Amino acid sequence: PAMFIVNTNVPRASVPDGFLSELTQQLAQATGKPPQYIAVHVVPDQLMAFGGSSEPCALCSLHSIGKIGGAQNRSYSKLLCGLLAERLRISPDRVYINYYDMNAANVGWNNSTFA
Amino acid sequence: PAMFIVNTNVPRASVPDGFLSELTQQLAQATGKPPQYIAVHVVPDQLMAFGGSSEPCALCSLHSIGKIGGAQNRSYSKLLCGLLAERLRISPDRVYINYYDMNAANVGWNNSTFA
Amino acid sequence: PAMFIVNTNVPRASVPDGFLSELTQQLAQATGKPPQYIAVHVVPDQLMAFGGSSEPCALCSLHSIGKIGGAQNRSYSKLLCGLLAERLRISPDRVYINYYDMNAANVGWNNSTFA
Numbered sequence: 001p002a003m004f005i006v007n008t009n010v011p012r013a014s015v016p017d018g019f020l021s022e023l024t025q026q027l028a029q030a031t032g033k034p035p036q037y038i039a040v041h042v043v044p045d046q047l048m049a050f051g052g053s054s055e056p057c058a059l060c061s062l063h064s065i066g067k068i069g070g071a072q073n074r075s076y077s078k079l080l081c082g083l084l085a086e087r088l089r090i091s092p093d094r095v096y097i098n099y100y101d102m103n104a105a106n107v108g109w110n111n112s113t114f115a
Numbered sequence: 116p117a118m119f120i121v122n123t124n125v126p127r128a129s130v131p132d133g134f135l136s137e138l139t140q141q142l143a144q145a146t147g148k149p150p151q152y153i154a155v156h157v158v159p160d161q162l163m164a165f166g167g168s169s170e171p172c173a174l175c176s177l178h179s180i181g182k183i184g185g186a187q188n189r190s191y192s193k194l195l196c197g198l199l200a201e202r203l204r205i206s207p208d209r210v211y212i213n214y215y216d217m218n219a220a221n222v223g224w225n226n227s228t229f230a
Numbered sequence: 231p232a233m234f235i236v237n238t239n240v241p242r243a244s245v246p247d248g249f250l251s252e253l254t255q256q257l258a259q260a261t262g263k264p265p266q267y268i269a270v271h272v273v274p275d276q277l278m279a280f281g282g283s284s285e286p287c288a289l290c291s292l293h294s295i296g297k298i299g300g301a302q303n304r305s306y307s308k309l310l311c312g313l314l315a316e317r318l319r320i321s322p323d324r325v326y327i328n329y330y331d332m333n334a335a336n337v338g339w340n341n342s343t344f345a
Contacts, residue, residue, distance in 0.1 A: 012162075015162070020164040020169070021167060024164055025167075039172065041161060042163075047273070048270065049254055049269065051265060052251060052265050054250070059271055060338075069335075073343045077338030077342055081340065093340040095338070095340070096338070097337070098293055105185045107214070108189075108212035110210070111207050113185070113189050113192055120237075135277065136282060139282045150282050153282070156278045157278075215328075217328060220299075220303060221298070221303060221328060221331075223303060224307070224323065224325060224326055225322045225325070226311045228300070
């Protein structure tokens, strides 16, 4: 299981059709998890500043049970920044992505947890 | 102290009156913390996908100073999924809840922290 | 690098001009990090309750690579609560701020991570 959130000041109208599906597919592929387990959340029109500037930016999070590590996080960032640059026109240097390796016992789903 | 956030694609109009109060009471009861210390945040109308589908779903978080564990998280999930299913018509298998056991020194409140 | 989020039920119109810039500067100063590395996100008009009440409140997070600790978090809360009280008219005792000391390998930026 893995969840990805994108918080951005880019307007809703600038989020292309298929964006959530593309994120789901690329992340399923990158983490090696079936897409059924990937959840995505996009939050446009946000009041944000990066480095004191209000030009396009994004603050993201990827919580995943496993598949988190030095090298994996580097490829995730390359993939994720490429997508935000191409799709939302956000410069890679105006993006932060926080990675969290979740313990299965700390992720609830379907009336229980993954423990 | 504990805080609970629900991010959902369910429309605002579908959130019943008293929903936040019910969450506050059930969580105070479940964690065994006075309700004065429970904070709740509900965020409807979100652009989300779960397993690649945009049917009703929810991504939630419960940050709590203590009261986090294998068995406790399982009961929290049963309680929380039951509420989302009954109140927001969200299927329990389309819900993720991330649990965080916060250190008191890492939770600020009233100009200081709980350390 | 550090990121700060404020989630509040205070209306958008009550957020003064320059609020995001002030937060950026105060946080750069407080953490001793150049402002270029500080990201800020303010989310008004939220459906929230604190202690069961819907009076003005805020649930915040400060994720920082380092500069997180018992004493530092205490000054951060004093600074942050002072700002929310003065700027948004939020009582310090109706504010929670969760502090996260992020590992550099778990923060992506500009196609890679800070590792």
